[PDB]
Design an enzyme around this catalytic site. Sequence first.
Site, PDB file in Angstrom:
ATOM      1  N   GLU A  22       0.933  -1.470   0.310  1.00 47.89           N
ATOM      2  CA  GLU A  22      -0.033   0.348  -0.201  1.00 47.89           C
ATOM      3  C   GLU A  22       0.684   1.059   0.195  1.00 47.89           C
ATOM      4  O   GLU A  22       0.509   2.571  -0.694  1.00 47.89           O
ATOM      5  CB  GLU A  22      -0.440  -0.210   1.061  1.00 47.89           C
ATOM      6  N   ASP A  31      -5.758   6.467  -5.332  1.00 49.75           N
ATOM      7  CA  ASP A  31      -5.501   5.305  -5.496  1.00 49.75           C
ATOM      8  C   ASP A  31      -5.526   5.110  -7.009  1.00 49.75           C
ATOM      9  O   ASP A  31      -6.109   5.165  -7.983  1.00 49.75           O
ATOM     10  CB  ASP A  31      -5.705   4.113  -4.481  1.00 49.75           C
ATOM     11  N   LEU A  43      -8.705   3.948   2.156  1.00 47.47           N
ATOM     12  CA  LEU A  43      -9.480   3.844   1.813  1.00 47.47           C
ATOM     13  C   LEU A  43     -10.449   4.801   2.460  1.00 47.47           C
ATOM     14  O   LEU A  43     -11.303   4.566   3.554  1.00 47.47           O
ATOM     15  CB  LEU A  43     -10.718   3.155   0.886  1.00 47.47           C
ATOM     16  N   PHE A 115      -8.221  -6.633   3.629  1.00 44.08           N
ATOM     17  CA  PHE A 115      -7.903  -4.939   3.439  1.00 44.08           C
ATOM     18  C   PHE A 115      -8.532  -4.252   2.406  1.00 44.08           C
ATOM     19  O   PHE A 115      -9.194  -3.028   2.360  1.00 44.08           O
ATOM     20  CB  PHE A 115      -6.366  -5.375   4.730  1.00 44.08           C
ATOM     21  N   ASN A 143      -6.009 -18.662 -10.971  1.00 40.55           N
ATOM     22  CA  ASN A 143      -7.689 -18.233 -10.625  1.00 40.55           C
ATOM     23  C   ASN A 143      -7.734 -16.378  -9.877  1.00 40.55           C
ATOM     24  O   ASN A 143      -8.526 -15.803 -10.877  1.00 40.55           O
ATOM     25  CB  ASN A 143      -8.170 -19.000 -10.019  1.00 40.55           C
TER      26      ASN A 143
END
Length: 175
Positions: A22, A31, A43, A115, A143
């Site tokens: 981050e 972001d 956020l 998170f 995946n």
Amino acid sequence: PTTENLYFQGSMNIFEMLRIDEGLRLKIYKDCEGYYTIGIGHLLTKSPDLNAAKSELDKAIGRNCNGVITKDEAEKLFNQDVDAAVRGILRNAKLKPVYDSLDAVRRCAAINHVFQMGVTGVAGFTNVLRMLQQKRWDEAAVNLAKSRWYNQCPDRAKRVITTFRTGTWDAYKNL
Ligand SMILES: Cc1cc(C(F)(F)F)n[nH]1
């Protein structure tokens, strides 16, 4: 591995992991998805309105910030967000059994994933959840690499995917 290399796993934990993925910013920024963010991946809001972001910030920190915080405040918020992600996993009937089955390092990758994406987002990887519980690590990683989460913002997600693959901290070495 050297004596120093064997010590490196003891230096890594969820806080250091997310700190790398981050970054650390003391001023509001957008972001990779264009959402106003601050600190270590906090956020603020999905609203495009900077004023809304500043309001959320002041609420979150508890003072009149005018879009700027201190390192200590970033770290406090960070700890609160990490605790929220862990709590989100453990109370969820779908995530908890998968998380429980995981080793310590992959548990960090799980907390990291939640998170970043939130609980319902993560719980929506139905097939990946089953693959993880069945220790099908390669398939899980393939995946995950199809997801919008990874593909829209690869630099923030890539290390987490590798960590799900390997259960080691290698993706966080040699920054
Ligand atoms: C795809 C996934 C599963 C998980 C967890 F939380 F371990 F269930 N985190 N991320």
